[PDB]
Design a protein around this ligand. Sequence first.
Ligand SMILES: Nc1ncnc2c1ncn2[C@@H]1O[C@H](CSCC[C@H](N)C(=O)O)[C@@H](O)[C@H]1O
Ligand SMILES: Nc1ncnc2c1ncn2[C@@H]1O[C@H](CSCC[C@H](N)C(=O)O)[C@@H](O)[C@H]1O
Ligand SMILES: O=C1Cc2ccc(Cl)cc2N1
Ligand SMILES: O=C1Cc2ccc(Cl)cc2N1
Lengths: 268, 257
Amino acid sequence: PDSAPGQAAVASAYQRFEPRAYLRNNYAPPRGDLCNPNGVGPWKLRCLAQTFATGEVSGRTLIDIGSGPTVYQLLSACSHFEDITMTDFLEVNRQELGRWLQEEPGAFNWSMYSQHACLIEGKGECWQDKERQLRARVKRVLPIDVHQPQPLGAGSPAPLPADALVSAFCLEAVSPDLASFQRALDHITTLLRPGGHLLLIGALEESWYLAGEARLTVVPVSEEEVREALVRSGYKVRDLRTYIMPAHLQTGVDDVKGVFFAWAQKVG
Amino acid sequence: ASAYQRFEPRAYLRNNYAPPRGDLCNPNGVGPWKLRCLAQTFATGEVSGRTLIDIGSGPTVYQLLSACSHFEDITMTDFLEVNRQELGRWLQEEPGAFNWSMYSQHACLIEGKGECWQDKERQLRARVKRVLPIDVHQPQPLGAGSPAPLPADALVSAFCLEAVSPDLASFQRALDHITTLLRPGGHLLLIGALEESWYLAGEARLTVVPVSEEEVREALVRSGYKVRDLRTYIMPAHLQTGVDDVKGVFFAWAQKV
Ligand SMILES: Nc1ncnc2c1ncn2[C@@H]1O[C@H](CSCC[C@H](N)C(=O)O)[C@@H](O)[C@H]1O
Ligand SMILES: Nc1ncnc2c1ncn2[C@@H]1O[C@H](CSCC[C@H](N)C(=O)O)[C@@H](O)[C@H]1O
Ligand SMILES: O=C1Cc2ccc(Cl)cc2N1
Ligand SMILES: O=C1Cc2ccc(Cl)cc2N1
């Protein structure tokens, strides 16, 4: 009926979100181990690489929805878009990205991820070049709130509508329930042009994860709930695959059961 | 040969394996070309067996990155103790070891098997069983009671022979010597400088015999090899740095017969 309470709880909880702990929890080993091809990191990168490798997802502008403190989700993307917008709710995350953009030593090191992306893209690109291009193509880092009908605000800086959207582990991680999730998907969809593409990666059947002091409440979603929401938002689903989280990667940082990858094209 | 007593490993790694010659990003540089020759050759599946020996390793490992997944027993060698020490520092992940990761990465990249560079380094470190003294000017370069399994199924040698031979004849004889280490029907991957007469290694100034591709080809023949492949990389101007007067690099894939 009324979305304010749940959304308020969410915003409250994220005030405690610690980027460094979150990076360590999910992007340092064992989950950040890119050597095991059956690991989640390599699967995520592979979903992205293969999708962009079709040549079917291109344009001038791309918006990454809920970037947090991570850039891996753009490694394969960056060679297909001149203009990239990164976004996040939390200033601290936006500053994390700032540190990487300035190429500071105190910044999180993504070079393994950059290398791995070069590896599976199979074009013999060195990772320093991939990183240099991503840094050059990120044109802005913006506040965002997906619960707003205009997630970027009014008169945003972003080129709208975008040719493509990327969003990894955001919607389910900030929506108290499925209806909120659906509305969030509707909101970000207004930023995408008709015939444009959305690459959505997320947690399956997760109810909580840790980011330092912050223990965050997640709406657990299934593949089928994800498919239906995409259709409900005006997408044709081109691809929807599932990674089942291996027991050895269940580290107590969350109760994630799996990860989904969706390639969807906005009808129009 | 006394000149090699002033040879500084770090200065050599600096001159040849750090930028610009060590930049692997540009596909037209010497580093990537070398790795490609090695990778492509092994990818054929025709160079294989159980044991491999690297002749004149110096302080470098890149020349075995593609090799290591085809040979369970690897022997590295050099004339200088300091080079063997520098190798030991990398093989044992000791302090102040040279950083080869860029090369491991590129080998993984070129090979295209989706392998992470750490697994690659791990395997190489696991398969190098020993680092031995050696002198190619000796009829038995490894000495008599060598811990090395002989004959080897395959040899690798990069920038050693021409770099240690006053003249063509010495070069030919040294090739003769190392060839005795190789099992008949075995393979030799030989990489070397073309038309070079000197190079620097810190305080060391080394004399080199300037050799041509045809001269390299004829040497292998005269040593009893069938030349399966012989390619030339011409050294671009921007990689002419003042550390030597190398004109090009040759890669030769030869088979003892
Ligand atoms: N109301 C809201 N609207 C849009 N993004 C939000 C939000 N509340 C929290 N977020 C951001 O959602 C992110 C979830 S973490 C995922 C980060 C990154 N995309 C990855 O792939 O690892 C956090 O960065 C959080 O700050
Ligand atoms: N008389 C001799 N017999 C065998 N090796 C020798 C030698 N005199 C010097 N060497 C070794 O020959 C090497 C030349 S440079 C090292 C080349 C290295 N494998 C790479 O590819 O870059 C030096 O390590 C040097 O110590
Ligand atoms: O591999 C992934 C990365 C990631 C981010 C956030 C959450 Cl809740 C779960 C996972 N698992
Ligand atoms: O690229 C290469 C590597 C190398 C080793 C030794 C010498 Cl004398 C010259 C070169 N040039």
